[PDB]
Design a protein around this ligand. Structure first.
Ligand SMILES: CN[C@@H]1C[C@H]2O[C@@](C)([C@@H]1OC)n1c3ccccc3c3c4c(c5c6c(n2c5c31)CCCC6)C(=O)N=C4
Length: 300
């Protein structure tokens, strides 16, 4: 909140990259899979190119730019690497290709093959992304299994900074305005007061971990979002997933304490899951247990 942010924003020529397929699309614009072939560097970087939507509202561009702002000011193995923007009519965000898609889909699609080892490693890896975000005094405000992408089954990275807010000169909490937020992932203090802290991010972590352990269930599957604040005030939380020893579950529960300072610090989460990741089967009981291409992580 006083350190100058000297991250470099890279402006890309539209002709430095070719689109190949079309990955997702819809409510935002279109995401393409493609390659970024800088200058005459002899490298090709698999990328994901997200473009505005077309029909350019001064509303849309102001946001993809905020995101670009945020994404350019982070550099961590567990946070998504933003390559640059391309300033065409329609602004494109260019980021690292996460070939295995997002983690939420990946656990669903692969239930019968996910071992305790992967699950705990993911948990540790996310804990690391977030603890780094906490260092950068950054509040994600939208942590969920949908917003973690899979670069390889053993390497996940946090994504989606369309809510992330950077904490100004020593603020503690962010006092957000109105507007849509995913209710089933939010700390209670967030629902009732729109306060967001690093600790409200812990809460969402707790739910993310619960999405992982139930191989992609939907939290409060039945309950509609309107009831939630009450239900949680009742002192009720999510069920202990089947595969989960009490050790693991106890940690989820801690992330869900009302007294935000009572919940654990990402640095502690790292320690705890990493102790557990040394003996995965003690904590999760799972039945069965082209030529010039370079990954963005090696292009510096
Ligand atoms: C719903 N499910 C979709 C699968 C997909 O389209 C979507 C639109 C969806 O999820 C949000 N989507 C995005 C939507 C908004 C921002 C970024 C993405 C996105 C990215 C990537 C995606 C990939 C695949 N989608 C990728 C991406 C499909 C599998 C290969 C990689 C990627 O590598 N970096 C970013």
């Amino acid at each position: 909140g006083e350190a100058p942010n000297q991250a470099l924003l890279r402006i890309l020529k539209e002709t430095e990259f070719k689109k190949i397929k079309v990955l997702g699309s819809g409510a935002f614009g279109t995401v393409y899979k493609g390659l970024w072939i800088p200058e005459g560097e002899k490298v090709k970087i698999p990328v994901a190119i997200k473009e505005l939507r077309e029909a350019t509202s001064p509303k849309a561009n102001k946001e993809i730019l905020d995101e670009a702002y945020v994404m350019a000011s982070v550099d961590n193995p567990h946070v998504c690497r933003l390559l640059g923007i391309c300033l065409t009519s329609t602004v494109q965000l260019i980021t690292q290709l996460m070939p295995f898609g997002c983690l939420l889909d990946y656990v669903r699609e692969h239930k019968d093959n996910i071992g305790s080892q992967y699950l705990l490693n993911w948990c540790v890896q996310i804990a690391k992304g977030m603890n780094y975000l906490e260092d950068r005094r950054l509040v994600h405000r939208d942590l969920a299994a949908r917003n973690v992408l899979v670069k390889t089954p053993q390497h996940v990275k946090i994504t989606d900074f369309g809510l992330a807010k950077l904490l100004g000169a020593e603020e503690k909490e962010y006092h957000a305005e109105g507007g849509k937020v995913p209710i089933k992932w939010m700390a209670l203090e967030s629902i009732l007061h729109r306060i967001y802290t690093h600790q409200s991010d812990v809460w969402s972590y707790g739910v993310t971990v619960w999405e992982l352990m139930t191989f992609g269930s939907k939290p409060y599957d039945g309950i509609p979002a309107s009831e939630i604040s009450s239900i949680l005030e009742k002192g009720e939380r999510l069920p202990q997933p089947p595969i989960c020893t009490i050790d693991v579950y106890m940690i989820m529960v801690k992330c869900w304490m009302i007294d935000a300072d009572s919940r654990p610090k990402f640095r502690e989460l790292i320690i705890e899951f990493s102790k557990m990741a040394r003996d995965p089967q003690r904590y999760l009981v799972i039945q069965g247990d082209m030529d010039d291409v370079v990954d963005a992580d090696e292009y510096l």
